[PDB]
Assembly symmetry: C5
Homo-oligomer: 205 residues x 5
């Protein structure tokens, strides 16, 4: 197999509308926000514009191929793949996807999708101008799939919070923490999982 064959096979057989659930267990989705910039903060209205990479991983065994004597990974347009229906609950604009919409697929079916996104959020901006800073909480989960179909978890790994954060922003990041939740909305009987990412930041002098 070469890349052309792999991509052809994926395109011809991939079912972008079918959740790759296996043996009726939930698809385990990992989500991690890598903050790149903070723009347009407004303490009066409690709104903020953020740019972040939304690192998203999951497994879809239907994409798998035998990689002996073949490429181990390819880049695939997300239009040809099933993608988790994640949404930020407190976003007040739709995601502006800044980057090419390609996911990376490994021969065992592991998928990585990591777009850079600019989005405006409603959250707690109070104290952005103090030492202790503001703490903006971003809530992300599957819009339509309950806990038996999609589980959402923060990425297990440690990292430099500001690793990719712009040195030219008027703001700086003090801390990022994550919390997993499972919520029952009065609309539906099942539980829906989400990750809450708490961004602690302040204005630089």
């Amino acid at each position: 197999l070469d890349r052309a064959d792999i991509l052809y096979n994926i395109r011809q057989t991939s079912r972008p509308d079918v959740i790759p659930t296996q043996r009726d267990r939930p698809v385990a989705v990992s989500v991690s926000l890598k903050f790149i910039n903070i723009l347009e903060v407004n303490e009066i209205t409690n709104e903020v514009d953020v740019v972040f990479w939304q690192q998203t991983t999951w497994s879809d065994r239907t994409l798998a191929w035998n990689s002996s004597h073949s490429p181990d990974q390819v880049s695939v347009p997300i239009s040809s793949l099933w993608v988790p229906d994640l949404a930020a609950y407190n976003a007040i604009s739709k995601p502006e996807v800044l980057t090419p919409q390609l996911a990376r697929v490994v021969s065992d079916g592991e998928v990585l999708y990591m777009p850079s996104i600019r989005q405006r959020f409603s959250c707690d901006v109070s104290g952005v101008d103090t030492e202790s800073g503001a703490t903006c909480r971003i809530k992300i989960g599957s819009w339509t799939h309950h806990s038996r179909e999609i589980s959402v978890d923060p990425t297990t790994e440690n990292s430099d919070d500001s690793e990719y954060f712009s040195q030219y922003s008027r703001f700086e990041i003090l801390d990022v923490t994550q919390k997993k939740n499972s919520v029952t909305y009065s609309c539906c009987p099942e539980a829906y999982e989400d990750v809450e990412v708490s961004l602690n930041f302040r204005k630089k002098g």
Copy 2:
């Protein structure tokens, strides 16, 4: 049947352009707005920006399947389904759909579509900065289907409302209407959602 089969069958045979009317009785559509946020209020111009979940339910039996030994529900792209042609009459921007455009379909054909929407409205903003607050009325109905084809009916007020909004919700009420426009002989149904809100102190 597995999910793949169900979704394949729906895709291959769904008529997104065909209203699932049965025996010429109207498709009964339920509409309910779950308010998430109020931004950008303007008492001078009587305009307001709102974020809300537009909970929409209806039945389409052409989607039904035998669910013994099969999944009972699936998520389906709305591009593969007929969806009611609802519009907010007093909206002054087109709906900005914030969420993935998927509906939930049950094996008996019951459909739920609940996108989060940001939209600007023309309505009564007067009194927003007072104790009794403003009351903004949002009118939603089928744009082109009369009452014999589509009926619209209303389904805690702040359950999902952002605690970080500059505004707070005092009350939400709903009223069903049936209106005859001078352009057309038939009646058209709508739901009027009255949002009573004020600026927080």
Copy 3:
């Protein structure tokens, strides 16, 4: 025939790119603007934002079906139908179509398309804050079809649908049909001019 059959037949056989001219006669298009709101008026720049229903009717016999023991009307996506190439000459933004893009088709081929549109216009805003108000003239006609292919006519209570919450009020709406020759081309092109007389309220 049920609705599914009718819609299937229309989709399979409709030619959205073909003007439904019959026997060399122009397609008779009716146009009427139902004003819903007036927002963002600017007397300095002579620009105004308007929301209106653009009621558009015409006949396309190719859509017709025998309706005894069948539905008499269906809603059809405009992407499946020929639609008149109308434009507002003095619009300075492209139409923002607010509503689902569906037309109503009757079994004899009569079509109604009535989207709610928000659009900005260049026009005479002077006097908007006076008793007699401003008179904004909106000119609408076929962009590319001359008078032998498309005729345009005004439709044989002005505030009926106008928002009571607008900062403005409508004093009067009048309509005039015109036939104009542009230097770019030898044939005449029809338009309807809708004159909206409005003023700022107390």
Copy 4:
């Protein structure tokens, strides 16, 4: 042939991606801007918003049909035709096309496309508020086709006839100049038309 047949044949056989070059000669494109309005002028930033009809003509013989006992002209969606890849070099927004995207095609293959366009430009706004006015130069040419593939020429005419009487501005004069430019990126010459719009604020 009726219109349905003509439009069907055009749709089925049109190669929107193929430049209708005939016999090693460049496709001759005519361009003319009919100014409708001038909005949002900014003398500090040298930027201006203009609305204009971009009258564009060329010949594509692959579209031709025998018109004896047939319509002589049809309106065709530009998605079904090859269209010149014109761009305004000094535009700072993408064209906002205001009108239905249809071209007029004559039975001999002559094409006319004339959309109304709103676009923002970077140009010389100085003096806009004086008697002699400002002169904004708009440069339009094929983005990717050199002079052996596309030639561009201005269409003696009043490019001002359609200008809004309700604009805050007025047009004093419009002139055109044809250029042939070599860019350091590429060895060939690329043609453009420069339209100079002389205008001022009304007093």
Copy 5:
């Protein structure tokens, strides 16, 4: 072959989704920014709006044809070609592509794609109002392809930095420099190449 045949063949056999890697060697991509205009500078927020031609070249042999007695080049919609997944890392708006989206393809498979783009960036705007000006660094590389699949290099050319820059801008260009980098991100084990274009400019 005429142009119609060439374009037909390209459309029918082109795999826009397949990186034209040849024999386990990265696709060599050249990138060069031709600055056209600088608008909307903000020294408080360190943001700037720039208009530039993003000159991008690479080779795709699957596009090649025998050009004896045939046209040597054609213009091709990029929707029919593989195109490098380049992104500007410090962009804060998506690229507004101003020009027709066509690439130029030579009979040997060389491709040139050069759209004019308007985009807003986060970068160092300080000193823009001084003699020495500001230096805004723009970082461009493949979003998803590591160094064994795509290499990125500045264009070998020497150039006049202001050749196409608008005389009507409120700003002027003092200097443009380029640096190639190879970076390892903590998300992945491989290295990703980028070009950093440093734009030294000031208010007139």
